Amino acid sequence: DCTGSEPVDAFQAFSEGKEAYVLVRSTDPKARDCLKGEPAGEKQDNTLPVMMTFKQGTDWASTDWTFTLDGAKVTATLGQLTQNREVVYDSQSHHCHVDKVEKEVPDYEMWMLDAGGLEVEVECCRQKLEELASGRNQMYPHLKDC
């Protein structure tokens, strides 16, 4: 069945902001190499401090974001930058989840704890992403010598 955590809750999907999640799949041809998200503090009200990292060529890169959580919704802000996402799927143990990136032509992403194990859950996330983004070429951001 591949039934995951329901109802879907962004905070729960992020392991209550106690873990780092890496981007493993994306329909975005602009997806950044090694894009990783990690907690950078405790949960301020419905907001969560997050440090996003990635690699540009051989150089590591960094940015700080404020996540605003509302159920399954995630509003990420940095300066004048605002990114809206909706966690559409969340694995049983909150090991991996699938996001819809809100925009003119929406993109879909698969994030997961940076660890092995719970491979059936990983497969389920992959399956849910295929459903949401069927027919879309996928990129593998974490498979870039990260």
Ligand X SMILES: CCCCCC[C@@H](O)C/C=C\CCCCCCCC(=O)O
Binding site for ligand X (CB under 6 A): 14, 17, 21, 32, 35, 37, 39, 48, 50, 52, 54, 63, 65, 74, 76, 83, 85, 99, 111
Q: Any binding-site annotation on 85?
A: yes
Q: Is the peptide bond before 141 cis (omega within 30 degrees of 0)?
A: no
Cβ proximity to ligand X, 14 vs 108, nearer residue: 14
Task: Give me the amino acid identity at 80.
Answer: Q
Cβ proximity to ligand X, 76 vs 146, nearer residue: 76
Least distance between ligand X and beta carbon 99 (Å): 5
122/111 Cα distance (integer angstroms):
10
Q: Any binding-site annotation on 63?
A: yes
Least distance between ligand X and beta carbon 19 (Å): 7
Are the C-beta atoms of 139 and 28 separated by less than 8 Å?
yes
Partnered with residue 120 across adjacent β-strands are none
Least distance between ligand X and beta carbon 8 (Å): 11
Q: Any binding-site annotation on 32?
A: yes
- Alpha carbon 106 to chain centroid, angstroms: 14
Cβ proximity to ligand X, 4 vs 39, nearer residue: 39
Cβ proximity to ligand X, 108 vs 111, nearer residue: 111
Annotated binding site for leukotriene B4: 32, 65, 85, 97, 99
Q: Which residues are annotated as a binding site?
A: 32, 63, 65, 85, 97, 99
